[model samples]
Target chain A: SLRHLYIEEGRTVCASATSRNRRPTSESSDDVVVVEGMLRGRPETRVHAMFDGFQGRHSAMWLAQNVMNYLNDLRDVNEEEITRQFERMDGDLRAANLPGGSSALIIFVRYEKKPTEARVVGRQIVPEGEFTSVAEALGGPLMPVVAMNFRRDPRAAKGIYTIHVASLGNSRCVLKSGRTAIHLSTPHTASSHKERHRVQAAGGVFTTVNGELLLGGVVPMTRAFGSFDFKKGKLQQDLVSAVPDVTTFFAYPGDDIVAGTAGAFAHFRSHAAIAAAIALYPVSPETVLDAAKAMVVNAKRRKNISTFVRHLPESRTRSQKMLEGTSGENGEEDFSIDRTNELTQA
Target chain B: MSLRHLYIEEGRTVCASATSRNRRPTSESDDVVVVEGMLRGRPETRVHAMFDGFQGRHSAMWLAQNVMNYLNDLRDVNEEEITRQFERMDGDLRAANLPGGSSALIIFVRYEKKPTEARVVGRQIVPEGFTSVAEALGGPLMPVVAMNFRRDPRAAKGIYTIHVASLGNSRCVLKSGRTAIHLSTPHTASSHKERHRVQAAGGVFTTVNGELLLGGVVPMTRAFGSFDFKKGKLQQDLVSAVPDVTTFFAYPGDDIVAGTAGAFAHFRSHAAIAAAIALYPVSPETVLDAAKAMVVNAKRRKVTKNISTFVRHLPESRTRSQKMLEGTSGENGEEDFSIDRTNELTQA
Candidate 1:
């Protein structure tokens, strides 16, 4: 009965054609949901309740929230346009699901916050076409936040999304504060048992008919994907269309805004975030670079920030001589005779 | 008939040596007469005549007079003592050599000035048993003056004495000025031609007749002996013994008493003469020591007026740190900090 609960919830379920065609007897059909939204407004009490409820009912929610705080408060992006884009994406997902108008909805919201005024203390960006540009750009005293997205091919059976968060500034403090965020998505496959296993491994929760939430996923994936790969040709095309290409978020506290080309602009956003984070919590140049590198890959494909971060600044080396200004006095003599005249007659 | 007859009138001949030995034509001949006495009661005229005679006959009288005047002015001796000693030695020689009562007279005359109120200022002695002790004690400033008695087996032969004296102090001045009174003697084989040749080679002048005079002998020997021969035994011994013996003198006027043993008294005098010489002439400690050493030896031998010169006095070698003191502050940060703290904090 628990395996048949999907029909009762009226949720649309999609699977790879291969798995759908097989239709094995042992396969269980349980309802699963995917909810997406721009995490905006005052962090909702309902979201908190849901987060807590999920922790108790199934397992902890594998929450990936893009706050859009930088866009509204700093970048001044159009909030309505962002909202329209979110709704359009939601409409498309709903249409694909069909029947019952999709019982579970995936929402993307863009919220606005008032911009705070501050001096442009520092700005850092990951330069283009480089692995670690942000690090070289903002050499010292900066932090970086990374956001990761995953897309699955429609013809594929499973997909994975991983997000890795790090702070280049004050690494010790960041680690001490336990602020690193790592999230791995549950496997999207037909085998309920394997799916449950994958979800549990990712620290995700599961539920049964007894109204019990089972702890399924716990292990967090260690790596984030910089590029994607598809299993089937069909899935590859679907992946190309459905994949959410970029993600961004603030890492540190600072006022400097970087404006450039699309690619440069993306890096600027990430660098500004990292710079703010690093400034707020100062860190060694090495740690800052390392965290910024991780964030750059996670944010977008912008080489400007990477290139900028990769460069080294000039240093001061030689010292000036100390004896330049002293007086030149020849030392003591045994006898300094200044004879006016000799007594010639005597 | 002889050319000697014609030459005799125009050029008066002063015998270079004693006439008795000169007549004999033997090796035991004196080259110059040893006259001793105080100048006869301000016999300026006679003295002037004698000097004129020496000048007229000698090719370089002017130069000789310059030297003679300097010596006469600076000599420190009494006239009576000089006469007594001369007469005593003359009487002894005449009595010993004459068959019956042939008169042989040796007179002592004061031909130079005698110094008064002389005191011993410096002294050093390198006796048979303690040569090194004298050098070690003399340090760097005192010149060394050595004496080798003729009877002593270690006596250096030939004209070593004159060369040593010339080396010791033979600076020429005007006829009216003073000259240093240095003495040296040879107590070795008479026939050492090589030794004599070395002395002559070192700028020692013999008498016109190729005879060594007391004036020539002492300085020659000393100048030669002053050479350090640490690298070789014979040479070192010869040179070391030479400069190690000397005397310095001061004169009041030109009337030296002969019997006063002023030469011996000068030896006994102190370092004052050496110090005075060094007043303006800043010499090497070695040279100063050479000069001081001469004073010390002269004092020890009782040739000078006082024995105070027998006291051990030598110039000190300046230390390296003292030399550095003349050149630089050599200050560093640490030194500055310390000095500042010392002046500011310690005083407070």
Candidate 2:
């Protein structure tokens, strides 16, 4: 069963997501709860928790102040001061309550430049979280990843901050790896889960970890599924054992990957699973024909072209369905008729 | 018939060898006489008078003064004063007596850094009967042409001026059929006659007739010559008629013509004639060859080389002839080789 998930660093709840049917409610619940699962060889359980009265209100001011204090303690005064000045207001400063019933304080820093205002606005938080160890409620400050969801006004959520983590036991991490992890912040929506399985079946790697994938410095497909740490600022080497063989069946269909956090999903289709499968198999002419048929079937079942056309209006009129089917009041032309006329003219 | 020679001028006395051979005469004898001769056309005898005393003791000076006076008279000066100066000189100035006799006088002017007392060191007279109207009387001034006969230093005559009428008439007669006339005082004995022929042959087309050809103006030759007057100073055309043909012959062999004036001749053998000839053909090759030969000869005759050898006396025991041949002798090798070489060896 999918469940509500949250990743914390120090006192901050840097990232959060809920599975399709596991939306959280305001109820009296324990700080830590563990559950046994059948997938593990033994009755393995992991704790989970949530902060009280801190949802959707992570102020950028509070996060900025906390980050400044943290960096100042590390003798990084310049970075601290710069962050204090540039962080925007109205960003949520929420705390993350870890499985140990301790508060993992999270801060969101907002950057705003107003037309009428002379001074550019920013935010800072005081008394930021201080964590002791990896086993504690929160380990340390996670690197931030700013992303936007289209359901919200893209301009308003243009730079929402997410957090990144390397491993449960790793002590050192860098910004690029943190960004990769942040990019993999897909919730277990029904579509997401299905897409994940589809990617996996097509020879991709999928990791069942309790963390926001697209948060902070993390490349999701390269790290979580591929099982390699790119956080050291070096190129991630191949972790073949960690990647699932299901990637061999995955196929890529798009001409281009869109720029956003969600665009990362296209990489699995273009790069990880599809690339691995193509490398593994010597595609003969017959095999390519069969693969083409399979791709057509897959494209038809998902109504993927229609869905894509709906999202991208420019593609709608040019689609084969629109060119061949009956007119839809917008004076649609029948491609079959046009082809016949063209043949007659030739 | 006996040739009775007449003496018209009363400047100098002349005694025939036949008459003087018999006995010595006193000073009072009238040496001027007339010579009667038969003409080819006329039956009656025509008498020609050859002046004897006209060849005076100071004949050159008298001639120069008379010619100067004639020139002054032609330019309209008092002729009486000029004749008085001539008569008071106590020499036969009879050349002044004839209507155009003073015209035969020639005035020679010498240019030197300083004036010095000089006397006639030599003299030569134009004999009767044999005469060319184109003849020049004096030797060259700038280039002193050495003669075969040794010069008596005391007898070195300076100059003799000539009157314009006699000079012009002579030139007119010589150039009668030609286009121009020219005359010159030759500096060298060898080139005297050659210089005369060049001037005569040049016709009336060259610039050299009126002006003195001294220093660089005179071309290399036994004596200097002039070009034709009608050619209008185009010297190159005048010289083309007679080119330098001397190189084809041997040296010091009378290769050049000597004029009747006892001076070196001016002719085709002249260097000016040769150069003018070269200008006509304009053969670069031949000109180059001639020029190279001239330079070589000039360097061989340079005095510095001879002076150095004489002062150093490095090879004192060499024969004078050997010394002169080696160009280490002070004597000019172009003159008498024997005396020059002997002087070199003896150091005297």
Candidate 3:
């Protein structure tokens, strides 16, 4: 079975698609989060995360609950605090000594006010462009000016757009910027030489399971949340650490971020395929939701694996298009934009 | 699978072994800071550091970036200044909302031209395989490294004092002349003084599932920013950010070896580290090789903690020490220590 959910907050649009495995399989341990709010002294922010649990769903459920609790707080959002929150959550997981562990991929999106200069032409705040009629009427001398017949200094503008990502284990976050797909998450698996060494050094042995090295004859990943079984006595190091690698980057117009559990990727085959699918349609709240549902449904037809994927499209395009009062391909008026900005009509 | 690397910063030779697999994955949390330049009005001033992060990597990353700048600008380099600066960092991290904390170990090496009372008295073969040098003919090697000044025949007499400030469990070991000693006192729940400090601040330790922890969670009694422990009225007193500072002289052949949790936990003792350090030559490469060997040795011994070993050789030359090594019994004198490196690794 499949489920889809769509969310909109400020200039951020998010959509998620999930599928639970068949009755023959274990309970679905995968979970998704999409919380929209504002941090103290910060602009509108969104927290999107995906968790894929191994061994059981208890750890994943606990992680989701804790993250929702964290998002509810009005704590300031920054690289340090965000990372520490993840680590703090891990510590809590270890304290509880839960039966299983989970792969966590978290994407924190914040819209910072990047101000831009606009010319005031006949009481209308317009970008620097042809305003000959207004300029001709208000100008007196050589330099034509709108509203005051003189050129003025640029003022502040509002259009936030940045993404900060953190992750552990195999669940991934990928950013489709322009023609290339940038992987924002690095998988920590037993096969990776670096992880292999660290695991062996921590006294964990690896054995082949279904042609892949399984750490301690069990877990496939070397870093994850919980896994109290691996974090046992006599081991000075955690075989499956809860430490998540963090990254923050600017998202340009038209960029799309796709965060998903490993099952989602397994169905899509590769990151490039997912990027290609997202690029098939112009990004919007409706289109992103449909696309996410389509991918989940399409993947479910091929495999009966528990999976979830979240699509976060940069809302700058919609905002800019609405600001320009542009029409879509069907020549229909931008109804959603016109309605939202109706109170502040220029 | 642990990794080891040798780095040179402002004439400081560093050898580090990182045993933890992920090691922050995206960015390194354990930082090695070496800023060598003029500070305020003091010339030949240097500030080097080792920070080990717990819970998260940001605090360690923040410390690596800011420790040098803060210590470099200090009007004076003394116990008071160093202690204050460390606390100031803790305050800044808290204000910035960094949820994690780190073990900070710093060495402020300053040189000032002054008068001297003696010249280098050459080298002496100690009772053990260890080697020592004296500033005065009859003076012991330990006193030579403990004092604040040393006179050498080569350079004019000067005041070369290394002011060390430490917080948390990052261990700083001083290979003074020949024997090694712990320069920094660990601020752990096991330490009686740290426990007293916490108790005096009206705080009690908690045992969770047989693990004794400070403030019920953190293992270390002093660190940069574990806000969970540093809550309410006693705030800082619960898990204080105050640093323990000590100053010592820089002598020829002396070493300042600072290590974090992984390094100390694996080696188990200062003597083991000292033995490891002596297995190589008295050059940049030697310290690096030895540091790498120590990390490898530790990992092979089945402890896989994320470890780092930073060895800073005092600027003064160790010609006498090298010459004494050349006189040791061997087919070609230098064969023993040089060949031992290969032998140790193969046997392990």
Candidate 4:
């Protein structure tokens, strides 16, 4: 029971990751950035089921049928039109009975004739018990994850495609292209019962019966794009934090990676999956998934994990199936996302 | 059943606590300061087992025996080293499903012939659900906590001792010296289930707990070090945040306090606690913890020492144990939490 969103896109090689600033392109300052990869289709437009089930209940079939209805409400998929309303959405869920520890991370890779750029919108962490902070504090950058070696011609470089399920506790994520590979995950979450203290979230991650490792888990985060508590405390003080880390990269045609949550970062030191995917790019997406799935197929696999994947084709108009869907912005100054959606469709 | 680390220290009216800066003393410096109570012993050292449980799990004895072990890893009881790792440690526990909503507020006091000072670190809240956050945003301070007074003779005056259980949602803390009394907490956590979307944390401070008032019952905090999810997406990017409001004050040294976590700053009207603790300086360390514990002790007594007071003979190096333990340190860049532990042994 996993859902992963990966993309293929063309990129550019410009500037280094060191001492960079995010400014609108000079030629068209407000020009919206359409992010994706050259290899994969823009699947964000089709799969809205991740959050919605056909009957309004979350299930693979249901999610596929009506999950993304929320996208219709958005004008632009950027941080502005979608994430800007994060608090409002979270509030809507919380006022009623909902889940907790829901998390996501996505990157917007904009490939243009001039330069290939990318921006990461979420955090990565170490697996259970151990803690890692991939995002920044309030008002800080989510470290815009970028791409590398793009020629003036706009051909795509070997890039990294990662996904994370924030609510999943033990679920981990890993990716690789040849020699390069990476993993992202959040802290372990099952020990809540005996340890006592608890976070305030349910359905944040999906849990299976008799503790199914084949599904997802629950955990909290200091930075995220959503959380009803954060929105509830929006105008006042924020009680529950959902801040996303914004980081960009200058990735080369290599096995670069970023998971929107801790899931894509799931699994063990998945050297085999990366090893399998390295020699073969898209061919291996299935290879790595299946390889990882092998370990999780067992009844005791929580000792295992889950899966969520999508292939988005370029839609004239699309919601943030990737970029804003994963997470980003900053820890300090408020993020405007500054763009609109509805118009982007036309 | 319970082991609370309390302190008692004798102090001098040295280095004023008034609008003081904790700069290391030097001619070009803004000057160092000392703080402590004019009464009691100089000994916050005695009460270390509140968290130490006889059971390895966390009743009293185990915490007493093992809790301080973690302290040994620390070079100084200063807030910097020990408390600095607070979040990281909490992070470790959170991921593994150990616990949620853990909080605490502790102070390390160092009294010296040159100067005496006090510092605090912590929080308590209700269990599960219901959230509370009331602080300033990016531009201003969240009213940097205030205080009553500090002396100039380079000796200790009034000492402060505080404790907050960050994870203990139902737990609350109070302080009183002869006449002063104060309280601290975070947003209501009990509204979770019914309100629907529940957090892993308990009432975290919902005000009532099966009529027991035990755990999440005694916490306080609002302005805290974290909550990035709260502020990270501010200015409209997304939801949640972790921004602290820094405020300067004509601060009343009478009993102003601030904690690094959001516990002590928990949901508050803000005007009451200090108002209650402002009147008198504590004469007995026990007076304060019991004052705080009494608010909690509807049942368990534990035969444990509620508080401890100390009077250092200035072994050429004593700290204003209590006052320093009460509160001080500003809200700007982070504090280094320098070490000054040896002198606290009672020479002064």
Q: Write the per-residue lDDT of candidate 4 for residues B214-248, one digit (tens) a residue.
A: 13332222212122222323332111112111111
In candidate 2, stretches whose alpha carbon ends up further than 4 angstroms from where it belongs are A1-346, B1-57, B75-92, B95-263, B266-348
* lDDT of each residue in A1-346, candidate 1, tens digit only: 0111112111111221111111101001111111111222322100100111111212111111211221122111222223323323222222122121111111111111222222121121221112222233233344453322212323111221111121110111111112222111111221345534644454444444345432222211111111012101112121111111121122222111111111222443443453344344322322332232333333354341110111110121122111100011001000011000000000
True contacts kept of each: 0.00, 0.00, 0.00, 0.00
DockQ of each: 0.00, 0.00, 0.01, 0.02
Q: What's every prediction's RMSD, in angstroms? A: 46.9, 53.8, 24.3, 22.9
| Residue pairs that clash (backbone atoms under 3 angstroms), model 3 | none
Q: List ranges where model 4 is wrong by over 4 Å.
A: A1-82, A99-101, A106-149, A152-175, A183-236, A248-292, A298-304, A308-346, B1-348
lDDT of 3 by residue, A126-198 (tens): 3332433222222222244444322232221224245667778877666655455555556767657876898
Query: Tens digits of per-residue lDDT for model 2 on A311-332?
Result: 1111112312111111110111
lDDT of 3 at A11: 25
Residue B87 of model 3 has an lDDT of 58
Off by more than 4 A, model 1:
A1-346, B1-5, B8-66, B78-186, B189-348
Query: How much RMSD separates candidate 2 from the native structure?
Result: 53.8
| Residue A275 lDDT (model 1) | 37
Number of the top-ranking candidate, with lDDT as the measure: 3
Better of 3 and 4 by TM-score: 3
The residue-level lDDT of candidate 4 at B145 comes to: 21
TM-score for chain A in each prediction: 0.17, 0.15, 0.64, 0.39
- Kindly list the interface RMSD, in angstroms, of each predicted candidate in the order they appear: 69.1, 67.6, 14.6, 16.1
Ranking by TM-score: 3, 4, 1, 2
